[PDB]
Amino acid sequence: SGFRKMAFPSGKVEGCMVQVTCGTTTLNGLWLDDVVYCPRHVICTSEDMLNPNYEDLLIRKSNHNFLVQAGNVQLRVIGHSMQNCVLKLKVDTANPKTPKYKFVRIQPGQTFSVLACYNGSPSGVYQCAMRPNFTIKGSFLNGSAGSVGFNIDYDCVSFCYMHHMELPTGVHAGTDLEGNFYGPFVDRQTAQAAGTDTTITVNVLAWLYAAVINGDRWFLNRFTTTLNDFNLVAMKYNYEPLTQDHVDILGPLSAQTGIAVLDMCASLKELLQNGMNGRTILGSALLEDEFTPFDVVRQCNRATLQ
Amino acid sequence: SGFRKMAFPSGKVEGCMVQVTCGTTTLNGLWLDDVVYCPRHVICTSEDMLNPNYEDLLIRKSNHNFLVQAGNVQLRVIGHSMQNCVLKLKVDTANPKTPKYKFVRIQPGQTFSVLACYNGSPSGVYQCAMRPNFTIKGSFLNGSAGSVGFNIDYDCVSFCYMHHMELPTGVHAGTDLEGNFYGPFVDRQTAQAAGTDTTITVNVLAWLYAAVINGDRWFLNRFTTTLNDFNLVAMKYNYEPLTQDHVDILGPLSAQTGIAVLDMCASLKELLQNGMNGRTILGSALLEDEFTPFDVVRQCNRATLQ
């Protein structure tokens, strides 16, 4: 019983974090085999961050300009490549703690765990979701760039996010591990803003089906709605329109419980218009969009053979 | 910017988790040097869990009755001691991944990070607080006993909780690492219940001072209250009475901001009686009691030199 927002265990990622310093600019890098991946703006001085020409900044930088430290071990840079917004530093030492890994680019709505680091030291770990506007509603301070986001399936760490910058609004933006930005953003200290943040309707649906499994069935269906109508009421509450793939992605949830997406969309229809009153669902006092279908079923209470 | 419930990085604890099996009963153990600490009810068969005599169950158990596995490595038990509700298995192999550690018994209100394991494999990590009734509002399934809770100061892991059982209500109960239970509970499958769960008022106060620092100052003080009056309104909302130590524990928060505990107690006075309306604080739509003063200041936005 119980229902918490869990991150994956962070140990396999902790063994890859290092400090990268170029000049008087320091952030974090991800050390896999003999390459350290880090945001490319580690090469920029304070003023160069308004409109950098990263090409030209890098061509003036030699290897000794880079200090990379794994704890008390200095790793010497023997070469570099710029790949999109991420800089690959080849180092003289292959990381003996490299886990089985891959790079994957996630989709908005999907969740992952973040290991927030400063000065190459892991600070803490927390679970989050890619918002539909491609930002993450994270918790990041200056010096946290290079912190990565990941998922762990069996023993294989799928890295999906590297952290670069914070938007004026306070939300965060970054790239995959190939350095391509998530969203229409750029690594430049320039006035930028994200689109309108919708709510991940499919995630809130998987959440309600969860409540139904564990026992919280207050506010359960008492009506119906054509997918279109829900979208109309959801539009006023910046709720991401619901598609039939959304209706199918629930998989073993409309079933294995026997309630319908529309019946749930109807309970959601009311809680967005009339409110939650004083009651709560799975502890949360607000509709939750950071749980996906896989996250839901893992924590759900099981049947007891007697 | 941003404000998330962060667990400490779990890696140092992951390297200590093992599987402990006695007979046909399996749970997790904590492997430090050449001792594995695990809940003592690993020695009980299904029926022995209503009213066990652990003394007598253990005296009938020899070392070979214990299978302890660290991954693919079997660790042979060479002796055991029962210490309160925790069983110490001495093993033929000292754990080379033992971090610098200590055992500490935390106080209700204090937070810690939980590494939930099944079959000796870390499953995920999440931050929680010891409730005033000594339960933890965790997320635990059968087989998760032996999962531990911890804090990390610098590189020293302070283990503070080992997980034993789930109450009828769905909340969780466990011991320190000396095996003394947190609360008036026992490792027996018997009808048990916790006291009334109060809210950690000092934690909600540190939270509001945080909101004030980061910028959310809606609902800020517009009145005053003698500590006594707040307690009167807090009594109806099962809010833990507020003491002057509580008023002093804020430390650099009433100051370093300049608002008063009572002014905050007054804003809290209203949000408990009239409500939060449609607004939220630091994202949460409910009053939060799982952040302490230290948790608050670490994540708060800093001043930019210009």
Author numbering:
A (entry chain A), B (entry chain A): 1 to 306
Q: What did the study's authors say about this model?
A:
The main protease of SARS-CoV-2 (Mpro, also referred to as 3-chymotrypsin-like protease or 3CLpro) is responsible for the majority of nsp processing, cleaving at 11 conserved sites along the polyprotein including self-excision of Mpro by autolytic cleavage of its own N-terminal and C-terminal autoprocessing sites. SARS-CoV-2 Mpro is a functional homodimer of two symmetrically disposed protomers that are each 306 residues in length (33.8 kDa). The active site of Mpro features a Cys145-His41 catalytic dyad, which orchestrates nucleophilic attack at the carbonyl carbon of the invariant P1 glutamine and the formation of an acyl enzyme intermediate central to efficient peptide cleavage. Using C-terminally substituted Mpro chimeras, we have determined X-ray crystallographic structures of Mpro in complex with 10 of its 11 viral cleavage sites, bound at full occupancy intermolecularly in trans, within the active site of either the native enzyme and/or a catalytic mutant (C145A).
Finally, C7, C9, and C13 (all in the context of C145A) have crystallized as rings composed of seven dimers. These all belong to space group C2 with C7 and C13 having seven monomers (half a ring) in the ASU and C9 (C145A) having 14 (complete ring). Notably, the large 14-mer ring structure composed of seven dimers has been observed from three distinct C-terminal variants crystallizing in different conditions. Analysis of the crystal packing with PISA27 shows the main interface between dimers ranges in surface area from 800 to 1000 Å2 with the ring assembly as a whole predicted to be stable. However, we do not observe evidence of these in solution and oligomerization appears to occlude free access to the active sites for external substrates suggesting that barring some negative regulatory role or inactive storage form, the oligomers observed are likely crystallographic rather than physiological interactions.
